[PDB]
Amino acid sequence: HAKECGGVFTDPKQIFKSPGFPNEYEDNQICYWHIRLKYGQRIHLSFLDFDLEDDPGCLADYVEIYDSYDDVHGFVGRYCGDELPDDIISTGNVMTLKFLSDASVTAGGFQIKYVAMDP
Ligand SMILES: [Ca+2]
Ligand SMILES: [Co+2]
């Protein structure tokens, strides 16, 4: 139980896993993680593991990161393949992660850490 993932996260620190990790993710997976810390705090995001389906535009499988509390504002990047994306630091107290896999081809998945940064 199961292909369940995401929600809102307000703790100082957490490691997000792709559903099933360390098993490969499944097809047709969508997950949203919304990080919200205290006003004045920022988010240091780091990639422990990253292995998704690869294609030139990441049109199939991807993890998207937003420097905001939605998946509309402050788009920082879209990632796939087996390269570890560089660390991401938020400009504010909010960050949004979206994972999507399409109908075919799976890979190892990911573990992504965030930690609070104080002023
Ligand atoms: Ca796929
Ligand atoms: Co606007």
Numbering used by the authors: 131 to 249
Text from the published report:
TSG-6 was shown to play a direct role in the transfer of HCs from IαI onto HA via the formation of covalent intermediates (HC1·TSG-6 and HC2·TSG-6) and act as a catalyst in this process. Hyaluronan is organized into a cross-linked network by the cooperative action of three proteins, inter-α-inhibitor (IαI), pentraxin-3, and TNF-stimulated gene-6 (TSG-6), driving the expansion of the COC and providing the cumulus matrix with its required viscoelastic properties. Here, we have determined the tertiary structure of the CUB module from human TSG-6, identifying a calcium ion-binding site and chelating glutamic acid residue that mediate the formation of HC·TSG-6.
To test our prediction that a functionally important metal ion-binding site is present within human TSG-6 (37, 85), we determined the crystal structure of its CUB module to 2.3 Å; this was based on the crystallization of the human CUB_C domain (i.e. the CUB module and the C-terminal 29 amino acid residues), which we had previously shown by NMR spectroscopy to be folded. This revealed it to have a classical CUB-type jelly roll fold, with a greater degree of similarity to the metal ion-binding subclass of CUB domains (C1s, MASPs) compared with the non-metal ion-binding spermadhesins, and, consistent with this, it contained a divalent cation at the site we had predicted. Overall, these data provide evidence that Ca2+ is not required for stabilization of the TSG-6 CUB module fold but rather plays a role in the local organization of loops surrounding the calcium ion-binding site and perhaps also has some effect on the stability of the protein core. The Glu-183 residue, which is involved in chelating the Ca2+ ion, makes a major contribution to the non-covalent interaction with HCs of IαI (e.g. via their Mg2+-containing MIDAS motifs), which precedes formation of the covalent bond between TSG-6 and HC. In particular, it probably orients the functionally important Glu-183 amino acid residue, allowing it to interact with the HC.
